[PDB]
Amino acid sequence: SDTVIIAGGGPVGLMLACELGLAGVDTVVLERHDAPREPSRGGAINATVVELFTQRGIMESLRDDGFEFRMAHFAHIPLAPERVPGDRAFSFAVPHAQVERRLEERARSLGVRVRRSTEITSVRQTPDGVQVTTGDGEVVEGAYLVGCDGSASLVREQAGIPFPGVDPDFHGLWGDIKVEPGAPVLERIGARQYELGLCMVAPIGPDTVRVITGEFDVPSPPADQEVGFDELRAAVARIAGVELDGVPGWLSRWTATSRQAERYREGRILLAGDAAHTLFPLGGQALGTGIEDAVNLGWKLAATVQGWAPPSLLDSYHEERHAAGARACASTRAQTTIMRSLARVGELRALLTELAGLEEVNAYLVRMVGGIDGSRLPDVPLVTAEGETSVYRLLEAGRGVLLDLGAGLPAVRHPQVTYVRAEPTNRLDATAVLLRPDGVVAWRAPQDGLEAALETWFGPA
Amino acid sequence: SDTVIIAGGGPVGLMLACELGLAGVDTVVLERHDAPREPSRGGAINATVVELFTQRGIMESLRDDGFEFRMAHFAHIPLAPERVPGDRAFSFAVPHAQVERRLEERARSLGVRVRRSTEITSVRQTPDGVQVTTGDGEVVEGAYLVGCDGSASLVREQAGIPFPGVDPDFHGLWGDIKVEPGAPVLERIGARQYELGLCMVAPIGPDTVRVITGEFDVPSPPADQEVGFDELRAAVARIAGVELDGVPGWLSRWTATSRQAERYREGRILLAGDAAHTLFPLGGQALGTGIEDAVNLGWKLAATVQGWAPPSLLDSYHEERHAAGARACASTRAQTTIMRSLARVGELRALLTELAGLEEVNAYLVRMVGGIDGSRLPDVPLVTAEGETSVYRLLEAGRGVLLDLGAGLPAVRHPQVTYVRAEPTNRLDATAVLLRPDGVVAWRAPQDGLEAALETWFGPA
Numbered sequence: 001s002d003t004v005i006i007a008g009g010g011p012v013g014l015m016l017a018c019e020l021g022l023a024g025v026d027t028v029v030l031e032r033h034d035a036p037r038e039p040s041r042g043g044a045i046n047a048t049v050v051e052l053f054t055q056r057g058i059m060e061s062l063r064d065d066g067f068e069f070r071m072a073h074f075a076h077i078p079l080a081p082e083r084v085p086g087d088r089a090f091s092f093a094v095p096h097a098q099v100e101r102r103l104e105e106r107a108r109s110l111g112v113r114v115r116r117s118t119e120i121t122s123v124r125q126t127p128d129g130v131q132v133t134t135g136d137g138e139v140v141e142g143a144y145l146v147g148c149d150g151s152a153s154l155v156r157e158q159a160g161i162p163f164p165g166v167d168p169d170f171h172g173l174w175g176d177i178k179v180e181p182g183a184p185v186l187e188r189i190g191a192r193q194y195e196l197g198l199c200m201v202a203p204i205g206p207d208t209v210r211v212i213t214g215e216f217d218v219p220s221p222p223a224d225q226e227v228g229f230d231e232l233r234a235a236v237a238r239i240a241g242v243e244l245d246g247v248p249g250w251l252s253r254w255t256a257t258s259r260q261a262e263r264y265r266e267g268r269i270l271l272a273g274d275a276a277h278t279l280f281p282l283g284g285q286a287l288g289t290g291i292e293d294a295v296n297l298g299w300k301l302a303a304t305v306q307g308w309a310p311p312s313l314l315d316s317y318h319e320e321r322h323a324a325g326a327r328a329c330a331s332t333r334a335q336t337t338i339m340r341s342l343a344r345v346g347e348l349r350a351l352l353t354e355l356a357g358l359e360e361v362n363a364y365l366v367r368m369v370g371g372i373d374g375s376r377l378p379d380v381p382l383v384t385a386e387g388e389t390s391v392y393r394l395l396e397a398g399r400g401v402l403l404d405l406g407a408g409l410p411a412v413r414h415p416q417v418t419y420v421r422a423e424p425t426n427r428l429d430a431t432a433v434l435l436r437p438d439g440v441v442a443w444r445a446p447q448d449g450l451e452a453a454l455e456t457w458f459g460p461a
Numbered sequence: 462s463d464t465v466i467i468a469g470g471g472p473v474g475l476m477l478a479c480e481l482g483l484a485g486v487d488t489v490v491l492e493r494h495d496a497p498r499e500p501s502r503g504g505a506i507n508a509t510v511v512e513l514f515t516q517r518g519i520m521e522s523l524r525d526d527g528f529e530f531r532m533a534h535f536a537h538i539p540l541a542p543e544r545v546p547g548d549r550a551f552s553f554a555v556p557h558a559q560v561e562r563r564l565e566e567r568a569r570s571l572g573v574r575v576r577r578s579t580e581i582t583s584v585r586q587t588p589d590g591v592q593v594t595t596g597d598g599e600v601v602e603g604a605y606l607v608g609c610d611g612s613a614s615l616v617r618e619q620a621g622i623p624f625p626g627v628d629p630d631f632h633g634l635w636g637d638i639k640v641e642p643g644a645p646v647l648e649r650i651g652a653r654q655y656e657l658g659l660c661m662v663a664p665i666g667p668d669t670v671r672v673i674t675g676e677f678d679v680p681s682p683p684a685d686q687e688v689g690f691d692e693l694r695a696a697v698a699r700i701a702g703v704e705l706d707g708v709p710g711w712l713s714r715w716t717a718t719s720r721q722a723e724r725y726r727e728g729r730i731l732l733a734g735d736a737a738h739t740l741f742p743l744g745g746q747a748l749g750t751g752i753e754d755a756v757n758l759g760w761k762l763a764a765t766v767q768g769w770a771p772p773s774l775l776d777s778y779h780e781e782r783h784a785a786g787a788r789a790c791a792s793t794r795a796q797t798t799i800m801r802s803l804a805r806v807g808e809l810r811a812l813l814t815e816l817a818g819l820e821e822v823n824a825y826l827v828r829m830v831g832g833i834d835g836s837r838l839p840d841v842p843l844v845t846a847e848g849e850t851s852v853y854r855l856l857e858a859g860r861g862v863l864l865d866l867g868a869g870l871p872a873v874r875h876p877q878v879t880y881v882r883a884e885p886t887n888r889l890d891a892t893a894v895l896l897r898p899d900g901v902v903a904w905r906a907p908q909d910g911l912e913a914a915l916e917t918w919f920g921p922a
């Protein structure tokens with residue numbers, strides 16, 4: 001079998017399906033729900049996601065679904081992203097349900113089989129492949145299975161993969177409320193750290209606000225106990241110091257679980273997204289880390305089933321993304337550490353605000369919280385023989401790219417790699433780079449080791 | 462009489478006494494102990510203390526009692542003080558008992574009456590004076606009383622000044638241990654943050670080490686209970702992961718108390734040092750803040766009893782030093798926030814450690830924990846008509862100084878101020894400054910308001 005089964009059709013699963021579909025791999029996603037769930041948990045995507053979408057032309061399809069914004073924070077300490085030199089993306093306000101719809105439409109348009117209303121009840125693997133049982137008794141078979149089935153992943157559990165980390169005492173609530181004009185909660189728009197905990201209030205409709213509260217190190221009802229509107233109102237009054245009234249729609253709990261799968265791969269079974277790491281939802285790193293799992297994995301998986309992957313390519317998924325996941329965990333825990341009561345962390349918060357005043361600190365934190373590092377390039381304009389283009393347009397094909405910016409290499413000739421010569425530009429501080437299909441820089445002038453890079457990621461030529 | 466009574470002859474009381482002695486004020490210090498106590502709680506003084514000692518020639522008297530060192534930390538994150546621009550002081554290693562001996566020696570040489578073996582039992586004031594009673598049944602009378610009587614200050618209590626702040630859960634032990642050669646505790650020399658808490662091991666004699674343990678947010682015996690050696694042995698094995706044995710010379714508890722007097726002045730009664738602020742003992746800010754209390758207060762009190770103090774000059778002691786105390790409080794609390802277990806603060810500690818690699822963060826933190834800001838100058842070499850000097854040498858007489866570095870003002874004529882003309886130097890970023898007797902800049906070119914500054918701090922010309 002040459003088929004990849006994706007367990008779960010959330011944002012990470014759907015992104016992975018898009019990657020595999022672009023690569024031309026036979027792919028099936030099994031998703032329990034008949035549609036993306038509403039209301040959306042998330043209302044924004046960070047620089048990591050924006051860039052990874054752009055290098056596949058996915059942001060254009062989201063153009064009219066939301067808006068660019070250029071704000072960021074570290075544990076609700078305001079940062080200034082537009083002061084940061086370079087050309088890295090900023091953030092984008094859009095409900096995650098809409099992101100999911102665009103991703104699903106893209107995946108289907110690429111030939112991926114999407115099976116909604118299909119519950120996985122059982123997961124097995126043999127030396128010859130992968131087998132999943134659905135709630136209708138059907139067995140679906142493939143070469144590989146990827147658990148993108150969220151925090152509580154059935155795939156992770158059935159694979160025997162431990163999920164270590166912590167479940168802190170935390171009282172977290174959220175919901176959409178229809179409010180009247182003049183509603184006191186409208187005086188608390190934004191995400192802020194108050195004396196006792198966090199409260200975020202955001203307009204999501206002409207008469208509607210999303211309200212989120214979170215208080216650390218305090219008792220909380222169990223996560224599947226019903227949330228009465230009076231509980232949310234009491235939290236808002238206690239934390240935000242304002243009276244909430246209105247007509248509640250959605251009301252639910254959320255947790256401060258911070259856990260990561262001990263390994264991202266077990267034979268023919270792999271993990272991505274929330275199944276692989278469940279982190280505190282801050283600044284878009286939670287989804288961002290999952291989306292970048294998907295992009296890291298897609299092309300490696302494809303190369304593997306198509307027969308041209310170097311022996312160790314698929315193992316580099318766990319190696320790179322478990323490290324990246326641990327760094328995301330570290331960043332988000334560093335943040336939640338100072339989201340305790342101000343009686344306990346107020347002074348350190350004020351110190352950090354002061355430090356964030358220093359240009360290098362602001363740049364450091366904006367990049368960290370956006371999930372941005374020097375492993376990928378910015379989407380910079382380029383001029384080639386075929387005219388004007390840019391770095392990320394070269395990556396839309398989903399193929400490796402040797403981009404020569406004046407280093408003047410003899411044209412690299414590898415069946416998996418596209419050689420592109422472009423005029424020099426000051427906006428990239430390398431005269432040549434080798435880009436993996438996920439956009440990651442595998443080599444750059446003037447480093448030695450170009451052939452080893454080529455062979456490591458694409459095989460010999 | 463017109464006598465200043467100082468309650469307490471610790472480092473802060475004795476420094477205050479030296480300041481008053483320099484200014485020619487009749488002064489008595491009442492101190493419970495027959496001699497500075499051993500063992501010393503502290504073994505180093507920070508940049509603030511070194512500078513304030515230097516501007517009175519006191520470091521000279523200490524030159525053979527210890528040694529300069531150039532290390533610093535923020536909650537045991539190592540810093541690099543020598544990378545910092547300026548001519549600001551570093552640290553000095555010396556037991557505090559010896560500092561006390563030198564300060565008392567200086568105070569006596571200036572004619573201060575130092576009465577040891579004296580228990581103060583009650584303190585009172587009348588419109589015309591202060592009255593303090595001793596355990597032997599005598600009354601000491603004066604014009605002003607200053608409480609330098611430590612953390613448990615009787616003077617603070619009897620003046621009815623509240624001591625708000627916090628007393629975190631904290632298990633702190635310390636003592637001096639005579640150990641056998643090859644003792645495993647010598648494998649842990651230094652002040653370090655471990656998994657569970659902090660431990661400092663410091664050689665203090667050929668076969669004697671000081672050992673200090675501290676663990677936050679765990680149960681502990683009350684601070685007045687006795688320490689058995691077994692308790693310290695367990696703490697060291699638990700925290701530092703090493704076996705301690707030997708013969709203890711002294712064992713006691715210490716707390717993470719962080720409190721500050723609501724006001725530093727109540728009529729003719731004032732507070733300084735630990736009586737004014739009890740902070741976490743870390744990096745030298747605990748003593749440093751007190752020493753600068755003493756230097757701030759001395760000349761102002763002198764001006765008050767000599768009749769040349771403007772009406773609100775003594776009040777400025779509370780305004781400045783309370784503010785400075787609050788900042789020290791905020792600083793040290795910031796630090797203790799990340800001295801919890803690494804299971805709770807490890808990621809934030811690692812992040813901060815990375816940020817401290819940025820030059821401006823390193824500078825910010827070194828200056829902060831050294832108590833150093835822009836309110837005083839460095840001790841820079843100067844060239845005057847009378848030959849070579851330095852900034853602090855001009856401050857040893859304890860008078861205000863109008864230091865003209867090429868601004869070429871007409872000679873300032875003020876009975877409390879010395880006008881000094883020096884050649885330009887690149888090591889001071891002003892062409893002229895007005896220095897208060899505590900070394901603090903009251904005015905600098907090209908600011909307006911030289912006359913106003915003169916009148917504010919030194920009265921009418």
Ligand SMILES: Cc1cc2nc3c(=O)[nH]c(=O)nc-3n(C[C@H](O)[C@H](O)[C@H](O)COP(=O)(O)OP(=O)(O)OC[C@H]3O[C@@H](n4cnc5c(N)ncnc54)[C@H](O)[C@@H]3O)c2cc1C
Nearest residue numbers: 008010011012032042119120149150273274281284286287
């Ligand atoms: C309250 C809250 C607010 C948040 N806000 C943000 C934000 O603003 N920005 C941000 O970036 N992130 C945010 N996050 C985090 C973000 O929602 C997740 O990181 C993201 O949804 C992870 O995507 P995923 O596809 O891995 O998992 P999911 O979105 O959970 O998708 C997993 C899918 O698998 C399906 N599934 C599960 N089990 C089975 C089964 N047995 N058979 C078939 N299908 C199955 C589920 O139906 C689901 O569709 C927030 C999270 C919470 C809780």
Ligand SMILES: Cc1cc2nc3c(=O)[nH]c(=O)nc-3n(C[C@H](O)[C@H](O)[C@H](O)COP(=O)(O)OP(=O)(O)OC[C@H]3O[C@@H](n4cnc5c(N)ncnc54)[C@H](O)[C@@H]3O)c2cc1C
Nearest residue numbers: 469471472473493503580581610611734735742745747748
């Ligand atoms: C374990 C420990 C380690 C420390 N380490 C450091 C360090 O490394 N660096 C640092 O800078 N700081 C350190 N400190 C803090 C430092 O010791 C204090 O900040 C400093 O001693 C304050 O000086 P002070 O003169 O205000 O009070 P004290 O030093 O407490 O002096 C007060 C004096 O008043 C006398 N007194 C009190 N009541 C009466 C009374 N009724 N009658 C007569 N006399 C009285 C006492 O005998 C005492 O001599 C440490 C503290 C502790 C507990």
